[PDB]
A paper describes a structure:
The recombination mediator complex RecFOR, consisting of the RecF, RecO, and RecR proteins, is needed to initiate homologous recombination in bacteria by positioning the recombinase protein RecA on damaged DNA. Bacteria from the phylum Campylobacterota, such as the pathogen Campylobacter jejuni, lack the recF gene and trigger homologous recombination using only RecR and RecO. Given that RecR interacts with RecF or RecO for the initiation of homologous recombination, RecR functions as the most critical recombination mediator protein in both the RecFOR and RecOR pathways. To elucidate the functional properties of C. jejuni RecR (cjRecR) in recombination initiation that differ from or are similar to those in RecF-expressing bacteria, we determined the crystal structure of cjRecR and performed structure-based binding analyses. cjRecR forms a rectangular ring-like tetrameric structure and coordinates a zinc ion using four cysteine residues, as observed for RecR proteins from RecF-expressing bacteria.
Numbering used by the authors:
A (entry chain D), C (entry chain C), D (entry chain A): 0 to 189
B (entry chain B): 5 to 189
The structure:
Amino acid sequence: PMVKGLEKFNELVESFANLPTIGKKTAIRLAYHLCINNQIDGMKLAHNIENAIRFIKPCEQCGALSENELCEICSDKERNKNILCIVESPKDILTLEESQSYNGLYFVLDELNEEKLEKLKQIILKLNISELIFALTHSINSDATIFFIEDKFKGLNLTFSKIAQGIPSGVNLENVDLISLNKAMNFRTK
Amino acid sequence: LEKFNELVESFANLPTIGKKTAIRLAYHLCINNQIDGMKLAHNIENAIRFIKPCEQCGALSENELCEICSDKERNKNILCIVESPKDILTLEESQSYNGLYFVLDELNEEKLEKLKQIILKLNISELIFALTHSINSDATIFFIEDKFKGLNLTFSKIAQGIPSGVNLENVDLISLNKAMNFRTK
Amino acid sequence: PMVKGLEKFNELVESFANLPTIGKKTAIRLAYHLCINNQIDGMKLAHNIENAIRFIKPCEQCGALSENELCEICSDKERNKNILCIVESPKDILTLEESQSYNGLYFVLDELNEEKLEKLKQIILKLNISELIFALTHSINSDATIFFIEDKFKGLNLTFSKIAQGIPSGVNLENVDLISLNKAMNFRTK
Amino acid sequence: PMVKGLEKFNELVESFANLPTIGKKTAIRLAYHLCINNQIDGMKLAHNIENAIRFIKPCEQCGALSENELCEICSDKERNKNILCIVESPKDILTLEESQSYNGLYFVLDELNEEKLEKLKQIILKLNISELIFALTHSINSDATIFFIEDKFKGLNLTFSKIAQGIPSGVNLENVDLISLNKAMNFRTK
Ligand SMILES: [Zn+2]
Ligand SMILES: [Zn+2]
Ligand SMILES: [Zn+2]
Ligand SMILES: [Zn+2]
């Protein structure tokens, strides 16, 4: 065990250690803090975990975090039901809404299940989606996903687009990776 | 989503955890691991309900005596004084010590009387101070040395100086000054 | 005195310290390095400093770094002599050339004095520039420049473009500013 | 090459990248800083490099950085001339001098020759040195050096000491390396 001679303490340490990006040292620090220094924070955390976990489930349509079977976005007819924006995570739906650039629909494609692809295929077929927008990070893996979705949905009159790769605000050109600089120059906008 | 933000805020309150990690952790519990998040909640509650200070030394314990104070193969003639129960976790992890510990988080008369009772009842021969190097800690050491002046006790502290395998130009000047004025044989 | 006792050595230390991003500890390290560990590297550096100060000058046409009257890019017949990319500093030309995304010409627009703008205009005319690329840091002061230049050259039948503002390679969506995100979604590619 | 087209400037950039802890990005910044703005600071840095390489020599007595035959420490009559601190690099003297902990003499023992040791013996006898301090990095190889010097100078009635090994001041135990923590428990002191 990660802590010897403390059955319930070591279980808690183990639980923190199985969280993403949490190492052994941090787990022990967190478990000690909640057991000795602020037990109210621990109880607060446990209640919030159970509170958030039984009331927040993925939207049945797109997968966004939601308190109902359909999220606020899917339950909105004053919304372009002809554009579908594919993302890797539900957090990206919050971010893309915060930008105030898009009024269409979303779909969280965090995995390529045969079953999750079929759900995507049924949204495209039932809403008459004419354009897929890939709002993926610009990365080697996102390439693989766009290629896969490009080969899979070859016959559906779909238009495929992806959010632009380029340079953010207030960044000097030398503080940008060369591959983004290349794309920003080759795909300069008028 | 107020329930999700509350979970994120509970994680950001944790020491050395920022908003970005807090958010990732919350998403991790709300999307996939519904069963594992329920077990983490249970494990928090379970550890808070069972963790208590060891009645003898003050360490983290789930019984009346901790496992170190319950181990008969322990060197019961040496006592190591620390200022936090966490320090026992750290010293145990160093694999350098097989004696007993005493958590001296305060300098009471009841705390000191407890210390004396252990020293007398176990015939302690050496008292090791493993405290942070500071003026306040020096004041604690001198106080214990005088209160227990004539018990035929040996007093030692953990070695202070330059760490192993570090070049002098990366050593803090203040620690370098100490290690030169406290040079050893 | 950062190193007491050694007059000539400490002057070398203070020189490194007087460089951008070079602190005291690094200065002593570099000075020590050149003085004891590799005096040939130090000699190489001193002559290379003198050589570059007596040979590198701003180019007559564009203002890039140059050893001659015209840089290697302006003296290159294989370049697209119909495109001109505007930058703020000659360093930006090095950066853009390393991206291997561009074969046109450059012009350093560090000031907006009318003499600098006539040169630019005469270059656009003499070379028959048909596209003017703005590779500036995306900022409010860059938009004012782009608007100012767009007005001054209103009747030269120029295509005006700007390097893409968008999401850089390998960056999560929440890690970019909302404006670049908004533009990355409004100017999508294929 | 790191900068194409301008070879004199690229040689300067490469000269800076040769410096320990200096990368291509910093090298270009430093080179351009010397070719554009501080054209006279760069000429003085070249002069200070050449001047320091011309004048720096090992102290004839101790081996420290010197500009004369004897360094300033070996020439200081207010120095405690009965104590000798052995270091393995002249940089260590700069560090220990800066600690304000010591007013004795130093000896650079970078090698274990017979001439180096005979020099050491000559200094110990000629100054009637009474204490020998070893300020070497804590390692097994350094332990072999101390034992060698302790034996060679067995019957000179010398005091042998080394700088204190242990946990550094003002660090919590959970942030101390476990191997150093193990040592400091074994070599605990009165
Ligand atoms: Zn939805
Ligand atoms: Zn105990
Ligand atoms: Zn030019
Ligand atoms: Zn000397």
